[model samples]
Target chain A: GVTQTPKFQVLKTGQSMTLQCAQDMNHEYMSWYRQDPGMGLRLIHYSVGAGITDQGEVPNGYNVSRSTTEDFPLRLLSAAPSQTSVYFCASSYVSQNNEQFFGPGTRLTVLEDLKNVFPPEVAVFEPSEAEISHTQKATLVCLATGFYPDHVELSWWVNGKEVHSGVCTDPQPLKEQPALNDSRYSLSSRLRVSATFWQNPRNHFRCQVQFYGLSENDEWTQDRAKPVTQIVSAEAWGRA
Target chain B: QSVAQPEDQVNVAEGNPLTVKCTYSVSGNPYLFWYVQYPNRGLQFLLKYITGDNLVKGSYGFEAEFNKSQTSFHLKKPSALVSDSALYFCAVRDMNSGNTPLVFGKGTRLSVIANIQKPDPAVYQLRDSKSSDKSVCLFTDFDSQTNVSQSKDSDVYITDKCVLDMRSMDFKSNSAVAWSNKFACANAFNNSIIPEDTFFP
Candidate 1:
């Protein structure tokens, strides 16, 4: 037998929706979309497989978690003027390395509001021996605190040029210590490289951390840090 | 992809003497070539192209017999032995293209009797000025099991007046063995000579 292709339909409209009591409560209430300053249009909405959740027109860059249909769509409208926009969209999959597919983004410009989105403070750790010496087989790790980003990716560069051999691990979900009032999250990734004696020079490695919001127009923040080196050598003793 | 026939098979005993074994095929016109090398070194200047006719060349106390009808050139030495193991490459120039690096086979290694006599220092300094001439020096300590004769020292020098670039010098002894065993047997110095560069005194 031959396989048949699946089909779907699309309907466009200019009307808006609000939280209603009867019928609106019967359908899934989870849908969110954001429209940043200069970005085109972003659709951010969640669907329940067999159950219904929240309602209303969600902002362009918000996160929605529903128990049912496990799918979400994030759309970006016209970007704002003052927006230093770098957008990222991520989705979880069943297995590791099979998780997220990112889209080449649209830079948005927001003229309305200009606020400094202070990237959560990144605590740079001295690169452990794993970062230097080919024999040591080092990996550079970057840690960020105070940000609850849904997804994170790590990139490596040597002297400002991208390194293709490095592997970037998935984001680790971190919760705030003492359970702070705002409840922040953090992520860390290790950039591993075969360490030979040649890599000891200063500033030989750099690690970049990236985070994106649920809105298509949400600006992503990136932070980079220099790698620290560890020296290893053999010493001689008195003749036996 | 070219398939090899049973008749085309080459068999050399592991510890016994070794001989050059090769065959070739071409579509239109053909130019068959042979290159011999020691480990970690470059391709020692071997024999190569032009129109018709087979040319004899001297290399590593070894001689190459060119065959036209068979469309192949087989490199051979009188005795098959262990120290001979290294990489051997064969190629044909694509005159039609005018600008292609000679295509090379992966290469064959001749592991003849080890420890043959090394060549004398005097042989390393002998340089022939004639164009198309070549000189090779092999360093091996002798072993009687292979019927290989023991030299005054460990070096064996061979000289030929064939058609290819030639250099006058033997690589450091034991240096050849160290390099050959670690990587490709071809001499590293000879391989550095690219086709485009002109040689000067």
Candidate 2:
């Protein structure tokens, strides 16, 4: 009753298990809940007495009932990938205006199958031939594609110096596939430099992509790209 | 932005000296920093090192020496007093680092104990001088050390020439806080100031 078995666990799709929860205190009401990242806590099921149960905000695929004065077990008929979250069990003496005791949470992750995540391929492109003749500032674009898990960051450098200003990066990675096991992502970033800065023959721009791997050493898998300068004609220079 | 303070406590005898230890490991040119915290008061800036000059002096007779060879920056004081007891911290940050936080070291507590055998002869008790908005006095009483220990305040004429001018001063500066505390301690304790030649500008 004091300990929640399996502090952490991973379940496969269609697998079923009971979340063991109990309380030594003589409480009549107990509940089961799950907290998902970036979301509020949600009640799955609760009980008022032995053999009695009721569904709360979300009860699909989850079942709970008080079997004895001390135990209220939450049963998963079939686990799904969407059920990955931290589950908590609690007990209360009354329904309102009282304190509720909570047990340590059990982190459960439901996997669809073995993950086949892949890192990204990176490339940089200079201002287009059409835009080079019309714009005074050159915008360099960097593309990162075919990455999984979407844990990637992009940065810019000019002539060995890290550039911070006039940079734009995608807020979210665009998913290329809809399947859970076949997910791939693509992202882009842009860096704009003054005409005089990019025109200097000694100056060059480099793009770097850092992909964070799951359960890895937090090492960055860097994929780098360098873009060639585009030509601006004498008339194109005078048009500014 | 890696910095560590190895000691948990630094004890010094009244009128004696001591040092608070700090060491750092960094990828780029690092900015070394120090701060102090007195009870009931938040953290106050002690000093910092960005470039040049291995030695830097801060408020309240505090100075730190940066030794690049040893990767150490130890806070040193020529003399210590009971009021000097407080928590000291060290920190560092890398130059040109993006989205990097300045890493801080766990604090080292400094405890300064007075010599019980020797009687303090230089203690100056404040004279009770009151001033009205319609009247003024040349002198004002600063609360005693006992009063300071109890978190008390004393009033003085705003135009008094003897008081330290603190208008438009950066309160974060150790010099400003230190000089103010120095004025108070000089009257509260017998301790005198060290020579300016021993301190950094």
Candidate 3:
């Protein structure tokens, strides 16, 4: 499975480690941690044989050391404002789909500076036109014009019910009239489906556009025009 | 080579159906003639053309009707609307010209309406220039440094310098980024310059 179950473990400050003996067999262990908020994690070094050891902080937040592949575990030996961190570890068995797993996340609140970085803003407008012919095939496009940060979504709805079986593709970029005071950016989406004329005539084809940074709350909707009521006779080749 | 004289200004009112009146004079041997466009949608696509006989395939719903004696092809429709208000270009290829790409007319905007009051034919003042140098520079900047960067960050700086010349000719860059920057500069110029400076300096 591409998905894995998460395991959780938490340790408080001033914790010491001692291995348990099972049937008089001795065990070895290792640990690592991070200190600065927003800084990365570091390997606290490791021991090769039973008593060999080395320890120190790694710069900029990445740490790794090898002992025995199976027994060495990352240790968060101490807790501090600098020590509040997120840790991740994985081990894979010999298979194409490795069995490596991620443990459930630990929420560590560090009392430090909080800064906000804003990404580019994008605005998407739903397509002004959509169409479906006599057949079941339907096409919907979202016309998003004049804004950046290109994240958006488009889905089909029939009689107010969302259809999950429909396939969706990536959005298409477009050109727009420049804004009076800024550059204009535009994008679009298209969808197709097949069905009989009578079964789809009254159905509504909607297009929606969205923008990034606007709290995912901003979107526009456009409904498709009523399906064609009359069909023209097909003409033969070489004739108009 | 052939040329449209007084090739600068062409106008049509919004929501007023207008026909782009065009005529051509080809030198030597003429093989293929075509109409093309750069819409708000994408790059240039062939609209229609005349080769051997009078018919050709083109994208969009556009078609061309060719007239051999008049040496021209006129693009028309039963009706045109605002959505059709985009850049329209025309080109022609001649065997005598040898490997020369098609010659194009600066794009003409077609604004359509339910009612169009015909303007005096004399107002168009159409003329044909016999110059064999059919090559035209749709865009040029006095400063080469201002128009030669490929990086996005440098685009604004280059566009600003190019607009300096275009502004004198009342032509603004149609691209979104260029338009916005041009508008801001226009506003500043309007506010800062004095009346005498407009004519004297």
Candidate 4:
């Protein structure tokens, strides 16, 4: 179940504390997204439906509405690619041995396009956890795992503004022998800053991870604001 | 001789949320089907319909809506992105249409344009420099971010910054998955009696 985060956010990336967090934060919107492989890098996110549309980038494919929420079963629509259903068809006319006489019975065993919705976990990694350590070293790392298509971005934001100054950034292919040679990348983004920079009280160092995604307009882009994680330790959040 | 999606072309720009409307005719087990087609691609299943209500059950926020009363099952999206494009097809299965089980409506094309005033984004545009590639349907970073994600394909192209596709979502890559056959039945219906049947109902 995709629950809201810190407040209005989906807690799964599915989490907890997120529901309490959003309603607590005076929730505005809640969305779920995916970063399936081979897409241009489009992020698919969804929210409750609003109304009739007359329009965008082949946007006519996805249908949504609270007004039309009626269904017998297994029927689905997605703001993202998170749906599918097992199908069995038959014709009621007995004469037709195999012409779909499959009499569509609601086996009711439905599923989301989960078999197809393969967006990876864009997890962020920290130098503190790695043997590569040093305090005040300000080596912020963005690690992405479990994703497909391999196209991703790691942007830096200090306090909130995008950063391109006083920083050096790049990505490294992390095979994670630690992962028992698992294929999902342990992708990382590195940004070097003053050793004392990360802990400073005024800045919230954030990484903007833009995974390759689909755009309605048929252009290359990110779904929303690519999934990003903050540079904080467990103790910082009282999670120790 | 019973399915129809009659929109011509859909135009949109990023920012505003949107939906595409379609009306279908299903008898016996009344139903409708929706699918999207990219510029150089085929239709990927969007959903199956049981009735016409403004409610669709999809991932978290995704859902479909219809007014069997209105005889339409429309497509919807969060906020329009600049990726979705190409043809969209809507079809129907009337269980009682006798022989025509699946009849598709002509698809609609959508054009999602760039924003009006805030046109060029240097920082956003500069993202074309991430390096990595190995025989990919990943829509490689520098290649284009226009088509990323699976259904995340609001993300139509699967080209932007992405990585979770152990199996690339490029359904178009398969030579066999080409074109939409919505009009395949152009040959006519009721061959048993035919539309011009003098004594046909």
Measured on C-alpha atoms, candidate 4 has an lDDT of 0.34
Candidate 3 per-residue lDDT over residues A1-240, each given as its tens digit: 111111211223343222111111122323332222223233334333344444534523323345443443443344334444444322223221111222222333222221111122222111111112211222232233434322333343444555533323232343233432223444423333343321345654444433222222322232522111111111111100
Worst 10 residues of 2 chain A by lDDT: A227-236
Writing each residue's lDDT as its tens digit, candidate 3 over B2-94 gives 533223234444344344545566776554333332221222444545345574445545556666776766555444543454545554545
lDDT of 1 by residue, B124-145 (tens): 1111112213222221111212
Output the better candidate (1/3) by TM-score: 3
- Ten consecutive residues with minimal summed lDDT in candidate 4 chain A? A231-240
Candidate 4 chain B has its poorest 10 consecutive residues by lDDT at B171-180
Fraction of the true interface contacts (Cα pairs closer than 8 Å across chains) found in each model: 0.00, 0.00, 0.00, 0.00
Residue A177 of model 2 has an lDDT of: 50
Candidate 2, residues A1-240, lDDT tens digits: the string is 344655555555787878888789888877776765433246688777788887766899898777797888888889998887877776756523223456776767675642444557665555432333333444455556667544455777777777756564554465555444556766655555555566666776677776544333222343532111111110011112
Q: RMSD in angstroms, candidate 4?
A: 22.1
Computed on alpha carbons, the lDDT of every model, listed in order, comes to 0.34, 0.55, 0.32, 0.34
What is candidate 1's DockQ? Answer: 0.01
lDDT of 4 by residue, B1-201 (tens): 355556677877655666676776655655666666552232455666664445775522335686766877787777765546455666665656543334456567766544433111011100111231201111111122232222221211111232211112221110000001121112211121221211110
B126 Cα displacement, candidate 4 (Å): 17
Ranked by TM-score from best down, the candidates are 2, 4, 3, 1
